[PDB]
Design an enzyme around this catalytic site. Structure first.
Site, mmCIF file in Angstrom:
data_model
loop_
_atom_site.group_PDB
_atom_site.id
_atom_site.type_symbol
_atom_site.label_atom_id
_atom_site.label_comp_id
_atom_site.label_asym_id
_atom_site.label_seq_id
_atom_site.Cartn_x
_atom_site.Cartn_y
_atom_site.Cartn_z
ATOM 1 N N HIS A 15 0.800 -1.232 0.000
ATOM 2 C CA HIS A 15 0.000 0.000 0.000
ATOM 3 C C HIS A 15 0.835 1.286 0.000
ATOM 4 O O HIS A 15 0.324 2.331 -0.402
ATOM 5 C CB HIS A 15 -1.050 -0.004 1.122
ATOM 6 C CG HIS A 15 -0.559 0.463 2.459
ATOM 7 N ND1 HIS A 15 -0.222 -0.439 3.462
ATOM 8 C CD2 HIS A 15 -0.480 1.717 2.957
ATOM 9 C CE1 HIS A 15 0.128 0.292 4.500
ATOM 10 N NE2 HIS A 15 0.000 1.597 4.243
ATOM 11 N N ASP B 113 -0.848 -7.307 1.877
ATOM 12 C CA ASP B 113 -0.140 -6.034 1.901
ATOM 13 C C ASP B 113 1.366 -6.227 2.146
ATOM 14 O O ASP B 113 1.882 -6.020 3.247
ATOM 15 C CB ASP B 113 -0.818 -5.054 2.884
ATOM 16 C CG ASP B 113 -0.238 -3.656 2.888
ATOM 17 O OD1 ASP B 113 0.293 -3.222 1.836
ATOM 18 O OD2 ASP B 113 -0.370 -2.975 3.905
ATOM 19 N N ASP C 162 0.136 1.690 19.847
ATOM 20 C CA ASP C 162 -0.087 1.149 18.492
ATOM 21 C C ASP C 162 0.940 1.694 17.498
ATOM 22 O O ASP C 162 1.595 2.682 17.788
ATOM 23 C CB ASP C 162 -1.482 1.588 18.000
ATOM 24 C CG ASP C 162 -2.113 0.758 16.885
ATOM 25 O OD1 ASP C 162 -1.451 -0.192 16.388
ATOM 26 O OD2 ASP C 162 -3.246 1.087 16.475
ATOM 27 N N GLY D 127 2.240 6.276 9.246
ATOM 28 C CA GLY D 127 3.617 6.631 8.906
ATOM 29 C C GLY D 127 4.621 5.520 9.177
ATOM 30 O O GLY D 127 5.760 5.567 8.670
ATOM 31 N N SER E 147 3.815 2.349 8.335
ATOM 32 C CA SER E 147 3.466 1.402 7.261
ATOM 33 C C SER E 147 4.712 0.820 6.599
ATOM 34 O O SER E 147 5.625 1.566 6.293
ATOM 35 C CB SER E 147 2.655 2.104 6.177
ATOM 36 O OG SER E 147 1.338 2.413 6.585
ATOM 37 N N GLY E 148 4.737 -0.491 6.388
ATOM 38 C CA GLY E 148 5.869 -1.171 5.748
ATOM 39 C C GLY E 148 6.953 -1.606 6.697
ATOM 40 O O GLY E 148 7.795 -2.428 6.335
HETATM 41 C C1 LIG Z 1 -3.450 -2.002 3.193
HETATM 42 C C2 LIG Z 1 -3.441 -0.750 3.889
HETATM 43 O O1 LIG Z 1 -4.793 -0.450 4.294
HETATM 44 C C3 LIG Z 1 -5.014 0.685 5.032
HETATM 45 C C4 LIG Z 1 -6.311 0.829 5.501
HETATM 46 C C5 LIG Z 1 -6.600 1.842 6.404
HETATM 47 O O2 LIG Z 1 -7.858 2.077 6.932
HETATM 48 C C6 LIG Z 1 -8.862 1.006 6.985
HETATM 49 C C7 LIG Z 1 -9.776 1.237 5.844
HETATM 50 C C8 LIG Z 1 -9.575 1.043 8.287
HETATM 51 C C9 LIG Z 1 -5.579 2.697 6.790
HETATM 52 F F1 LIG Z 1 -5.838 3.655 7.703
HETATM 53 C C10 LIG Z 1 -4.287 2.600 6.295
HETATM 54 C C11 LIG Z 1 -3.181 3.532 6.780
HETATM 55 N N1 LIG Z 1 -2.142 2.741 7.429
HETATM 56 C C12 LIG Z 1 -2.204 2.361 8.773
HETATM 57 C C13 LIG Z 1 -1.233 1.510 9.291
HETATM 58 C C14 LIG Z 1 -1.307 1.081 10.607
HETATM 59 C C15 LIG Z 1 -2.338 1.507 11.443
HETATM 60 C C16 LIG Z 1 -2.420 1.018 12.849
HETATM 61 N N2 LIG Z 1 -3.391 1.511 13.645
HETATM 62 N N3 LIG Z 1 -1.617 0.093 13.214
HETATM 63 C C17 LIG Z 1 -3.310 2.355 10.909
HETATM 64 C C18 LIG Z 1 -3.235 2.793 9.601
HETATM 65 C C19 LIG Z 1 -2.691 4.263 5.568
HETATM 66 N N4 LIG Z 1 -1.511 4.147 4.995
HETATM 67 C C20 LIG Z 1 -1.473 5.104 4.007
HETATM 68 C C21 LIG Z 1 -0.221 5.291 3.249
HETATM 69 C C22 LIG Z 1 0.985 5.301 3.953
HETATM 70 C C23 LIG Z 1 2.180 5.476 3.279
HETATM 71 C C24 LIG Z 1 2.196 5.618 1.905
HETATM 72 C C25 LIG Z 1 1.013 5.610 1.186
HETATM 73 C C26 LIG Z 1 -0.206 5.447 1.847
HETATM 74 C C27 LIG Z 1 -1.452 5.405 1.017
HETATM 75 N N5 LIG Z 1 -1.622 4.354 0.227
HETATM 76 O O3 LIG Z 1 -2.283 6.338 1.090
HETATM 77 C C28 LIG Z 1 -2.660 5.780 3.995
HETATM 78 N N6 LIG Z 1 -3.422 5.229 4.969
HETATM 79 C C29 LIG Z 1 -4.013 1.565 5.410
#
Ligand SMILES: CCOc1cc(OC(C)C)c(F)c([C@@H](Nc2ccc(C(=N)N)cc2)c2nc(-c3ccccc3C(N)=O)c[nH]2)c1
Ligand SMILES: [Ca+2]
Lengths: 57, 254
Positions: free
Chosen positions: B41, B90, B186, B190, B192-193
Protein backbone atom coordinates in the site's frame (compact mmCIF):
# COMPACT_ATOMS: atom_id res chain seq x y z
CA UNK A 1 7.61 -40.46 12.99
CA UNK A 2 7.32 -36.65 13.64
CA UNK A 3 10.03 -34.72 15.61
CA UNK A 4 10.02 -31.03 14.41
CA UNK A 5 6.35 -30.67 15.50
CA UNK A 6 7.57 -31.01 19.13
CA UNK A 7 9.50 -27.95 20.43
CA UNK A 8 11.10 -27.26 16.99
CA UNK A 9 12.87 -30.68 17.43
CA UNK A 10 15.21 -28.98 19.94
CA UNK A 11 16.60 -26.77 17.08
CA UNK A 12 17.77 -23.21 17.85
CA UNK A 13 16.67 -22.06 14.37
CA UNK A 14 15.30 -24.45 11.66
CA UNK A 15 14.17 -28.08 11.93
CA UNK A 16 13.97 -30.76 9.21
CA UNK A 17 12.33 -34.21 9.58
CA UNK A 18 13.93 -37.28 7.90
CA UNK A 19 12.92 -40.99 7.52
CA UNK A 20 12.33 -42.67 10.89
CA UNK A 21 13.44 -40.83 14.04
CA UNK A 22 16.10 -38.79 12.14
CA UNK A 23 16.04 -35.00 12.69
CA UNK A 24 18.32 -32.38 11.14
CA UNK A 25 18.65 -28.85 12.57
CA UNK A 26 19.67 -26.08 10.18
CA UNK A 27 20.68 -22.41 10.43
CA UNK A 28 20.01 -19.27 8.42
CA UNK A 29 22.82 -18.04 6.04
CA UNK A 30 25.65 -16.32 8.01
CA UNK A 31 25.44 -19.13 10.67
CA UNK A 32 26.78 -22.70 11.08
CA UNK A 33 25.43 -25.61 13.11
CA UNK A 34 27.52 -26.55 16.23
CA UNK A 35 28.54 -30.21 16.87
CA UNK A 36 25.65 -30.46 19.43
CA UNK A 37 23.50 -30.53 16.26
CA UNK A 38 20.99 -27.93 17.61
CA UNK A 39 22.90 -24.63 18.09
CA UNK A 40 23.76 -22.02 15.53
CA UNK A 41 26.86 -19.85 15.67
CA UNK A 42 27.62 -16.84 13.41
CA UNK A 43 30.10 -17.35 10.54
CA UNK A 44 30.11 -13.59 9.75
CA UNK A 45 30.63 -10.31 11.60
CA UNK A 46 26.99 -9.13 11.08
CA UNK A 47 24.64 -12.18 11.12
CA UNK A 48 20.93 -11.48 10.67
CA UNK A 49 18.75 -10.86 13.77
CA UNK A 50 21.58 -9.91 16.14
CA UNK A 51 22.22 -6.38 17.50
CA UNK A 52 25.99 -5.57 17.39
CA UNK A 53 25.99 -2.81 20.05
CA UNK A 54 24.17 -5.27 22.44
CA UNK A 55 26.30 -8.31 21.34
CA UNK A 56 29.57 -6.32 21.85
CA UNK A 57 28.52 -5.10 25.39
CA UNK B 1 4.47 4.80 16.82
CA UNK B 2 2.03 5.73 19.64
CA UNK B 3 2.95 5.10 23.30
CA UNK B 4 6.39 3.59 22.56
CA UNK B 5 9.89 4.90 23.22
CA UNK B 6 12.94 6.00 21.22
CA UNK B 7 14.71 2.90 19.84
CA UNK B 8 18.33 3.49 21.09
CA UNK B 9 20.52 4.21 18.01
CA UNK B 10 21.77 0.90 16.51
CA UNK B 11 19.18 -1.24 18.38
CA UNK B 12 16.80 -1.33 15.34
CA UNK B 13 19.59 -1.85 12.68
CA UNK B 14 17.28 -3.59 10.15
CA UNK B 15 14.86 -0.62 10.06
CA UNK B 16 14.51 0.96 6.60
CA UNK B 17 13.42 4.51 5.80
CA UNK B 18 11.76 4.79 2.37
CA UNK B 19 11.81 8.21 0.65
CA UNK B 20 10.20 9.56 -2.57
CA UNK B 21 11.67 12.90 -3.87
CA UNK B 22 13.45 13.07 -0.47
CA UNK B 23 10.07 12.95 1.38
CA UNK B 24 9.27 10.31 4.09
CA UNK B 25 7.08 7.59 2.55
CA UNK B 26 7.20 4.36 4.60
CA UNK B 27 9.18 1.97 6.69
CA UNK B 28 10.74 -1.31 5.61
CA UNK B 29 12.91 -4.18 6.84
CA UNK B 30 16.35 -5.13 5.51
CA UNK B 31 16.41 -8.99 5.17
CA UNK B 32 19.91 -9.22 3.47
CA UNK B 33 22.35 -6.71 1.74
CA UNK B 34 20.08 -6.31 -1.34
CA UNK B 35 16.49 -6.98 -0.26
CA UNK B 36 13.93 -4.91 1.68
CA UNK B 37 10.46 -6.11 2.75
CA UNK B 38 7.75 -3.36 3.00
CA UNK B 39 3.92 -2.90 2.50
CA UNK B 40 2.35 -2.90 -0.98
CA UNK B 41 0.00 0.00 0.00
CA UNK B 42 3.08 2.32 0.33
CA UNK B 43 3.24 2.45 -3.50
CA UNK B 44 -0.46 3.02 -4.38
CA UNK B 45 0.16 6.72 -5.15
CA UNK B 46 3.74 6.58 -6.59
CA UNK B 47 4.22 8.43 -9.93
CA UNK B 48 8.01 9.00 -9.59
CA UNK B 49 9.22 5.35 -9.51
CA UNK B 50 12.84 6.44 -10.28
CA UNK B 51 13.01 8.67 -7.16
CA UNK B 52 12.55 5.87 -4.62
CA UNK B 53 15.37 5.70 -2.02
CA UNK B 54 15.91 3.21 0.83
CA UNK B 55 18.00 4.65 3.72
CA UNK B 56 19.69 2.16 6.11
CA UNK B 57 21.24 2.99 9.54
CA UNK B 58 18.91 5.96 9.95
CA UNK B 59 18.12 7.13 13.46
CA UNK B 60 17.62 10.91 13.70
CA UNK B 61 15.96 12.69 10.70
CA UNK B 62 17.25 16.15 11.71
CA UNK B 63 20.98 15.28 11.40
CA UNK B 64 23.42 13.30 9.27
CA UNK B 65 25.84 11.36 11.59
CA UNK B 66 27.63 9.28 8.89
CA UNK B 67 26.02 5.89 9.65
CA UNK B 68 23.19 6.39 7.08
CA UNK B 69 23.50 4.49 3.78
CA UNK B 70 21.19 5.35 0.87
CA UNK B 71 20.33 3.11 -2.05
CA UNK B 72 18.13 3.57 -5.09
CA UNK B 73 15.31 1.07 -5.30
CA UNK B 74 15.74 -0.89 -8.61
CA UNK B 75 12.49 -2.90 -8.23
CA UNK B 76 9.20 -2.97 -6.23
CA UNK B 77 7.62 -6.44 -6.41
CA UNK B 78 3.97 -6.78 -5.36
CA UNK B 79 1.82 -9.98 -5.36
CA UNK B 80 -0.78 -10.30 -8.15
CA UNK B 81 -3.50 -10.83 -5.48
CA UNK B 82 -3.02 -7.35 -3.95
CA UNK B 83 -5.67 -4.82 -5.03
CA UNK B 84 -4.65 -1.06 -4.67
CA UNK B 85 -6.72 0.78 -2.04
CA UNK B 86 -7.70 -2.54 -0.28
CA UNK B 87 -6.09 -4.35 2.66
CA UNK B 88 -5.34 -7.98 1.67
CA UNK B 89 -1.82 -9.20 0.69
CA UNK B 90 -0.14 -6.03 1.90
CA UNK B 91 3.51 -6.90 1.12
CA UNK B 92 6.20 -5.51 -1.24
CA UNK B 93 9.66 -6.92 -1.99
CA UNK B 94 12.22 -4.22 -2.86
CA UNK B 95 15.50 -4.81 -4.71
CA UNK B 96 18.29 -2.31 -4.02
CA UNK B 97 20.44 -1.28 -7.07
CA UNK B 98 23.62 -2.13 -5.12
CA UNK B 99 24.06 -3.92 -1.75
CA UNK B 100 24.34 -1.98 1.49
CA UNK B 101 27.49 -2.55 3.57
CA UNK B 102 26.72 -4.27 6.89
CA UNK B 103 28.07 -2.30 9.92
CA UNK B 104 27.13 -2.01 13.68
CA UNK B 105 24.25 0.22 12.50
CA UNK B 106 23.18 -1.75 9.35
CA UNK B 107 22.14 -5.42 9.91
CA UNK B 108 19.36 -7.50 8.30
CA UNK B 109 16.48 -9.06 10.22
CA UNK B 110 16.23 -12.84 9.57
CA UNK B 111 13.45 -13.84 7.16
CA UNK B 112 12.44 -17.17 8.84
CA UNK B 113 11.36 -20.41 7.15
CA UNK B 114 7.59 -20.85 6.94
CA UNK B 115 7.11 -23.89 9.27
CA UNK B 116 9.34 -22.43 12.03
CA UNK B 117 7.47 -19.10 11.71
CA UNK B 118 4.01 -20.82 11.81
CA UNK B 119 4.76 -23.38 14.58
CA UNK B 120 7.23 -21.44 16.78
CA UNK B 121 7.33 -17.65 16.07
CA UNK B 122 3.51 -17.30 15.77
CA UNK B 123 3.34 -18.25 19.55
CA UNK B 124 5.95 -15.77 20.85
CA UNK B 125 3.43 -13.35 22.41
CA UNK B 126 5.40 -10.08 22.32
CA UNK B 127 7.22 -8.59 19.33
CA UNK B 128 8.66 -5.16 18.53
CA UNK B 129 7.15 -2.69 16.03
CA UNK B 130 9.07 0.44 14.90
CA UNK B 131 9.11 3.52 12.69
CA UNK B 132 9.18 7.31 12.27
CA UNK B 133 5.35 7.43 12.10
CA UNK B 134 2.84 9.57 14.02
CA UNK B 135 3.42 9.90 17.78
CA UNK B 136 -0.36 10.41 18.05
CA UNK B 137 -3.37 9.80 15.86
CA UNK B 138 -3.68 13.02 13.75
CA UNK B 139 -0.40 14.17 15.34
CA UNK B 140 3.19 14.94 14.26
CA UNK B 141 5.56 12.17 13.00
CA UNK B 142 8.73 11.21 14.95
CA UNK B 143 12.26 12.73 14.33
CA UNK B 144 13.95 9.75 16.09
CA UNK B 145 13.14 6.10 15.37
CA UNK B 146 10.48 4.80 17.78
CA UNK B 147 9.87 1.24 18.97
CA UNK B 148 6.90 -0.43 20.74
CA UNK B 149 6.46 -3.93 22.25
CA UNK B 150 3.09 -5.44 21.24
CA UNK B 151 1.32 -8.73 22.08
CA UNK B 152 -0.07 -10.87 19.22
CA UNK B 153 -3.69 -12.12 19.21
CA UNK B 154 -5.45 -15.06 17.52
CA UNK B 155 -7.83 -13.61 14.88
CA UNK B 156 -10.99 -14.99 16.68
CA UNK B 157 -9.85 -13.21 19.90
CA UNK B 158 -9.04 -10.01 17.96
CA UNK B 159 -12.56 -9.99 16.45
CA UNK B 160 -14.26 -10.63 19.84
CA UNK B 161 -12.21 -7.93 21.65
CA UNK B 162 -12.82 -5.29 18.93
CA UNK B 163 -15.66 -2.74 18.76
CA UNK B 164 -17.91 -3.66 15.80
CA UNK B 165 -17.53 -1.06 12.99
CA UNK B 166 -19.54 -0.95 9.74
CA UNK B 167 -17.69 -1.64 6.44
CA UNK B 168 -14.50 -2.65 8.47
CA UNK B 169 -12.20 -4.89 6.31
CA UNK B 170 -11.97 -8.63 6.96
CA UNK B 171 -8.95 -9.96 8.89
CA UNK B 172 -7.79 -12.72 6.53
CA UNK B 173 -5.30 -15.59 6.97
CA UNK B 174 -2.73 -13.13 5.43
CA UNK B 175 -2.95 -10.80 8.47
CA UNK B 176 -2.78 -10.87 12.26
CA UNK B 177 -3.71 -8.47 15.08
CA UNK B 178 -1.24 -7.17 17.64
CA UNK B 179 -1.42 -4.36 20.16
CA UNK B 180 -3.84 -2.94 22.73
CA UNK B 181 -7.57 -2.10 22.66
CA UNK B 182 -7.29 0.61 25.41
CA UNK B 183 -6.09 3.46 23.09
CA UNK B 184 -2.62 3.75 24.59
CA UNK B 185 -0.18 1.92 22.26
CA UNK B 186 -0.09 1.15 18.49
CA UNK B 187 1.79 1.59 15.17
CA UNK B 188 0.39 4.31 12.79
CA UNK B 189 0.11 5.04 9.03
CA UNK B 190 3.62 6.63 8.91
CA UNK B 191 5.03 3.30 10.27
CA UNK B 192 3.47 1.40 7.26
CA UNK B 193 5.87 -1.17 5.75
CA UNK B 194 7.93 -1.27 8.93
CA UNK B 195 8.93 -4.42 10.85
CA UNK B 196 7.07 -6.49 13.43
CA UNK B 197 10.16 -8.33 14.79
CA UNK B 198 10.04 -11.52 16.95
CA UNK B 199 12.76 -12.74 19.34
CA UNK B 200 13.52 -16.46 19.59
CA UNK B 201 16.53 -18.01 21.35
CA UNK B 202 18.81 -14.96 20.97
CA UNK B 203 17.80 -14.06 17.38
CA UNK B 204 15.25 -11.64 15.87
CA UNK B 205 12.97 -12.65 12.95
CA UNK B 206 10.55 -10.94 10.56
CA UNK B 207 6.93 -11.97 11.34
CA UNK B 208 4.80 -8.99 10.33
CA UNK B 209 4.61 -5.72 8.41
CA UNK B 210 2.87 -2.54 9.69
CA UNK B 211 -0.24 -2.66 7.53
CA UNK B 212 -3.55 -1.12 8.74
CA UNK B 213 -5.94 -0.33 11.60
CA UNK B 214 -8.98 1.83 12.53
CA UNK B 215 -7.20 5.16 13.13
CA UNK B 216 -4.08 4.86 15.37
CA UNK B 217 -4.39 3.55 19.00
CA UNK B 218 -8.21 3.74 18.75
CA UNK B 219 -10.13 2.43 21.81
CA UNK B 220 -11.67 -0.93 20.86
CA UNK B 221 -9.17 -1.66 18.05
CA UNK B 222 -5.84 -3.39 17.41
CA UNK B 223 -3.07 -2.86 14.87
CA UNK B 224 -3.36 -5.20 11.88
CA UNK B 225 -0.12 -6.66 10.39
CA UNK B 226 0.72 -8.62 7.18
CA UNK B 227 1.30 -12.28 8.14
CA UNK B 228 4.79 -12.68 6.54
CA UNK B 229 4.88 -16.55 7.07
CA UNK B 230 2.32 -16.84 4.20
CA UNK B 231 4.90 -15.22 1.81
CA UNK B 232 8.25 -16.97 2.64
CA UNK B 233 8.34 -19.16 -0.55
CA UNK B 234 7.04 -16.30 -2.73
CA UNK B 235 9.85 -14.03 -1.38
CA UNK B 236 12.57 -16.73 -1.73
CA UNK B 237 11.71 -17.45 -5.36
CA UNK B 238 11.74 -13.72 -6.27
CA UNK B 239 15.10 -13.13 -4.51
CA UNK B 240 16.52 -15.75 -6.96
CA UNK B 241 15.13 -13.94 -10.04
CA UNK B 242 16.85 -11.49 -12.38
CA UNK B 243 15.46 -7.91 -12.31
CA UNK B 244 13.19 -6.69 -15.13
CA UNK B 245 13.00 -3.18 -16.74
CA UNK B 246 10.56 -0.89 -14.99
CA UNK B 247 10.61 -0.46 -11.21
CA UNK B 248 7.14 -1.88 -10.45
CA UNK B 249 6.62 -5.61 -11.00
CA UNK B 250 3.40 -7.56 -10.24
CA UNK B 251 4.38 -11.22 -9.52
CA UNK B 252 1.95 -14.18 -9.34
CA UNK B 253 0.87 -15.19 -5.84
CA UNK B 254 1.02 -18.10 -4.77
C1 LIG C 1 -3.45 -2.00 3.19
C2 LIG C 1 -3.44 -0.75 3.89
O1 LIG C 1 -4.79 -0.45 4.29
C3 LIG C 1 -5.01 0.69 5.03
C4 LIG C 1 -6.31 0.83 5.50
C5 LIG C 1 -6.60 1.84 6.40
O2 LIG C 1 -7.86 2.08 6.93
C6 LIG C 1 -8.86 1.01 6.98
C7 LIG C 1 -9.78 1.24 5.84
C8 LIG C 1 -9.58 1.04 8.29
C9 LIG C 1 -5.58 2.70 6.79
F1 LIG C 1 -5.84 3.66 7.70
C10 LIG C 1 -4.29 2.60 6.29
C11 LIG C 1 -3.18 3.53 6.78
N1 LIG C 1 -2.14 2.74 7.43
C12 LIG C 1 -2.20 2.36 8.77
C13 LIG C 1 -1.23 1.51 9.29
C14 LIG C 1 -1.31 1.08 10.61
C15 LIG C 1 -2.34 1.51 11.44
C16 LIG C 1 -2.42 1.02 12.85
N2 LIG C 1 -3.39 1.51 13.64
N3 LIG C 1 -1.62 0.09 13.21
C17 LIG C 1 -3.31 2.35 10.91
C18 LIG C 1 -3.24 2.79 9.60
C19 LIG C 1 -2.69 4.26 5.57
N4 LIG C 1 -1.51 4.15 5.00
C20 LIG C 1 -1.47 5.10 4.01
C21 LIG C 1 -0.22 5.29 3.25
C22 LIG C 1 0.99 5.30 3.95
C23 LIG C 1 2.18 5.48 3.28
C24 LIG C 1 2.20 5.62 1.91
C25 LIG C 1 1.01 5.61 1.19
C26 LIG C 1 -0.21 5.45 1.85
C27 LIG C 1 -1.45 5.41 1.02
N5 LIG C 1 -1.62 4.35 0.23
O3 LIG C 1 -2.28 6.34 1.09
C28 LIG C 1 -2.66 5.78 3.99
N6 LIG C 1 -3.42 5.23 4.97
C29 LIG C 1 -4.01 1.56 5.41
CA1 LIG D 1 20.31 10.89 10.49
Amino acid sequence: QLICVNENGGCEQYCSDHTGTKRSCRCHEGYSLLADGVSCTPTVEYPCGKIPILEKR
Amino acid sequence: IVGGKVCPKGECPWQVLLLVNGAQLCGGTLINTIWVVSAAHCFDKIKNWRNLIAVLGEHDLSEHDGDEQSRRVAQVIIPSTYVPGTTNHDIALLRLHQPVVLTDHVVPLCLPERTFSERTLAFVRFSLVSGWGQLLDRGATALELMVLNVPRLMTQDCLQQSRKVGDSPNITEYMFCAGYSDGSKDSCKGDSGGPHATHYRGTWYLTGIVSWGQGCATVGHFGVYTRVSQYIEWLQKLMRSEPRPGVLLRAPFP
